[PDB]
């Protein structure tokens, strides 16, 4: 159109969140918080650019205890400044939300879809099984599930524009779903997000947070076999160890 390949395929840091370790290993006894890398990803595409995630909720910023009072206080803090809302990343990084030809919401999760609010006209491409379950699962904020965004609901795989593939990865979530992307640098990328935290999560099936840990390596086998075929590049949702090698804005791949 003519393009097979996204030209460019940017990694974004969005903040942080802190997690106790046994959401890494569900195997460790808790007690040890890993302050983990928020990621949002720009995709500048032939038919325009494309954002993957939208970083925390407002009510993060310079908020750690925001899940105090609930089931998961002490369990998650949130390290979010004002730098880290959607909206000024993406101003600094030279775009407006009204800019974007499409979101992608890899699932509802806060650390995904917190700025979701954001996009009032941009179509949401988001699984129908997640959005079903953000309208009552209690793991969900207000923020993740705004009722009048422009949503594109889709069901299972899916092909945004040519290079964008959505894979669908339920486990984590309810509806997630991870991409493989192709890109001009670098041709194969799998963007697992949440469908593994980390490379052990994927490579030794560590189990690691979920709503359905069995779905999850389920997902994680899939998944397995599109990398026995397309040897990809792959990289984790929430990995401290491989952001440490990953190249990031104004990098790209
Ligand atoms: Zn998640
Ligand atoms: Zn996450």
Same mark, same amino acid.
């Given at each position: *159109?003519?393009?097979?390949?996204?030209?460019?395929?940017?990694?974004?840091?969005?903040?942080?969140?802190?997690?106790?370790?046994?959401?890494?290993?569900?195997?460790?006894?808790?007690?040890?918080?890993?302050?983990?890398?928020?990621?949002?990803?720009?995709?500048?595409?032939? #038919?325009?650019?494309?954002?993957?995630?939208?970083?925390?909720?407002?009510?993060?910023?310079?908020?750690?205890?925001?899940?105090?009072?609930?089931?998961?206080?002490?369990?998650?803090?949130?390290?979010?400044?004002?730098? $880290?809302?959607?909206?000024?990343?993406?101003? /600094?990084?030279?775009?407006?939300?009204?800019?974007?030809?499409?979101?992608?919401?890899?699932?509802?999760?806060?650390?995904?879809?917190?700025?979701?609010?954001?996009?009032?006209?941009?179509?949401?491409?988001?699984? /129908?099984?997640?959005?079903?379950?953000?309208?009552? /699962?209690? #793991?969900?904020?207000?923020?993740?599930?705004?009722?009048?965004?422009?949503?594109?609901?889709?069901?299972?795989?899916?092909?945004?524009?040519?290079?964008?593939?959505?894979?669908?990865? !339920? *486990?984590?979530? !309810? *509806?997630?779903?991870?991409?493989?992307?192709?890109?001009?640098?670098?041709?194969?990328?799998?963007?697992?997000? $949440?469908?593994?935290?980390?490379?052990?999560?994927?490579?030794?099936?560590? !189990?690691?947070?979920?709503? $359905?840990?069995?779905?999850?390596?389920?997902?994680?086998?899939?998944?397995?076999?599109?990398?026995?075929? #397309?040897?990809?590049?792959?990289?984790?949702?929430?990995?401290?160890?491989?952001?440490?090698?990953?190249?990031?804005?104004?990098?790209?791949?």
């Amino acid at each position: *159109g003519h393009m097979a390949t996204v030209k460019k395929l940017y990694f974004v840091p969005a903040g942080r969140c802190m997690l106790d370790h046994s959401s890494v290993n569900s195997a460790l006894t808790p007690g040890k918080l890993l302050n983990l890398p928020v990621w949002c990803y720009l995709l500048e595409t032939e #038919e325009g650019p494309i954002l993957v995630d939208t970083g925390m909720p407002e009510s993060a910023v310079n908020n750690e205890g925001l899940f105090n009072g609930t089931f998961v206080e002490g369990q998650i803090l949130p390290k979010m400044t004002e730098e $880290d809302r959607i909206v000024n990343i993406l101003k /600094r990084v030279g775009y407006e939300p009204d800019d974007l030809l499409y979101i992608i919401s890899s699932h509802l999760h806060f650390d995904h879809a917190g700025g979701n609010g954001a996009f009032t006209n941009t179509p949401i491409i988001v699984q /129908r099984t997640e959005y079903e379950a953000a309208l009552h /699962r209690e #793991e969900y904020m207000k923020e993740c599930i705004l009722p009048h965004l422009n949503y594109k609901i889709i069901e299972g795989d899916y092909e945004v524009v040519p290079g964008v593939q959505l894979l669908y990865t !339920p *486990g984590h979530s !309810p *509806g997630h779903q991870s991409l493989f992307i192709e890109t001009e640098q670098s041709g194969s990328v799998l963007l697992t997000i $949440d469908a593994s935290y980390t490379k052990e999560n994927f490579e030794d099936e560590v !189990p690691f947070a979920g709503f $359905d840990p069995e779905l999850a390596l389920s997902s994680i086998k899939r998944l397995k076999e599109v990398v026995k075929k #397309e040897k990809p590049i792959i990289f984790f949702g929430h990995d401290i160890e491989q952001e440490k090698s990953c190249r990031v804005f104004p990098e790209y791949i």
